């Protein structure tokens, strides 16, 4: 059953986790970055100085041109490329075949990556999002509806080179600790929740819930950091340099602009605080809070070297790798639905641990939303 998909994901340190995908008959094998942040199922179709692999459709008896062209912008970076459809599969996935939508990627701009071992990207998220427009049937919705895979997937993002467990299917008990807690999915687009209260060291930051979610909040496998809007960012920086100020660092540090260091074994984890983020629960007036602590927040590179991964946003709240590490985390699209456990893979630390908690109470959590 979901054994077969256990550690089935790949990666380098913030450069995203991949899977294993084969397209076209006779099989291509092409490493896929696993995106719950956009929409297009997207590949390497012709040859750039950072791919050593990419799709020859020339060579698929199965391919079939759709005749259009298509373009997608990511957060930096972006390419456009050719529609069309083929076969595909999952070799560590379910044990089936299906046609769907891909877009061979003619050019690009500071997308691939140096080196990261991944020729495209899945996205896992709602047509709403698709590029050319929401008529492009995204992979997800063409593997449910031509299988009898159930409508729901779960992901295991492991920090420290990187691995780590995408169950298609369903949800695989190994693979965490403890409850699942559940938010609704606000609206399928992007995976979209609505975050209600932030607390640093166990004090609410205290601004109105609706800051946090200023945009939107999405879950985004294919982010590295923590983002937060502008105003919420500033606050939670300050009560970090707060809570942290045994020791003073750079400010390009604060920035993300550079590292710091220890000697091996020597890093301060005590002094930095846990987050907690409150999300929205299942039921009326419901609340749970999921706790990351700063070996989440602290990006790794004889001394040890950390990156801050909690940066600024102006268009909404990011919950990507740095808050997945933490978690077992289930899109259930059946029951619009996010679950959230702690797991078994998790960062864990002497005299504290990444948690999931609940129930708490939480008065007009619709009204955290944005409009
Ligand atoms: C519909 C396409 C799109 C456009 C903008 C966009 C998103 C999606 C949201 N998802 C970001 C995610 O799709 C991408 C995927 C990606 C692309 C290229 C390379 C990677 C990862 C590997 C990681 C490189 C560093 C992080 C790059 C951030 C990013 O844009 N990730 C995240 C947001 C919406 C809130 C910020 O921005």
Known sequence: ?????????????????????????????????????????????????????????????????????????????????????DLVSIPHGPNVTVRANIAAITESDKFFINGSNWEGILGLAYAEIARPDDSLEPFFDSLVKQTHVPNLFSLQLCGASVGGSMIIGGIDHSLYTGSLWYTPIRREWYYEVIIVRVEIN?????????????????????T?????????????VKSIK???????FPDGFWLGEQLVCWQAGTTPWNIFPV???????????????????????????????????????????????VIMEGFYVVFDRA?????????????????????????????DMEDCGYN
């Open 1 to 85: 059953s979901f054994v077969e998909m256990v550690d089935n994901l790949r990666g380098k340190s913030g450069q995203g986790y991949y899977v294993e995908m084969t397209v076209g008959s006779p099989p291509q094998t092409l490493n896929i970055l696993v995106d719950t942040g956009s929409s297009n199922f997207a590949v390497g179709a012709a040859p750039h100085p950072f791919l050593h692999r990419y799709y020859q459709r020339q060579l698929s008896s199965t391919y079939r041109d759709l005749r259009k062209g298509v373009y997608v912008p990511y957060t930096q970076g972006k390419w456009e490329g050719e529609l069309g459809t």
């Open 202 to 222: 166990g004090q609410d930051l205290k601004m109105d819930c609706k800051e946090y979610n200023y945009d939107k909040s999405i879950v985004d496998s294919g």
């Open 224 to 236: 590295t950091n923590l983002r937060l809007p502008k105003k919420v960012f500033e606050a939670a």
């Open 242 to 248: 707060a809570a942290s100020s045994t020791e003073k």
């Open 275 to 321: 987050i907690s983020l409150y999300l929205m629960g299942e039921v009326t007036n419901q609340s749970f809070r999921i706790t990351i602590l700063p070996q989440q927040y602290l990006r790794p590179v004889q001394d040890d070297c950390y990156k801050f991964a909690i940066s600024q946003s102006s268009t909404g709240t990011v919950m990507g790798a």
């Open 335 to 363: 029951r619009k639905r996010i679950g959230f456990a702690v797991s078994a893979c998790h960062v864990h630390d002497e005299f504290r641990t990444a948690a999931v908690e609940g129930p708490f109470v939480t008065l």
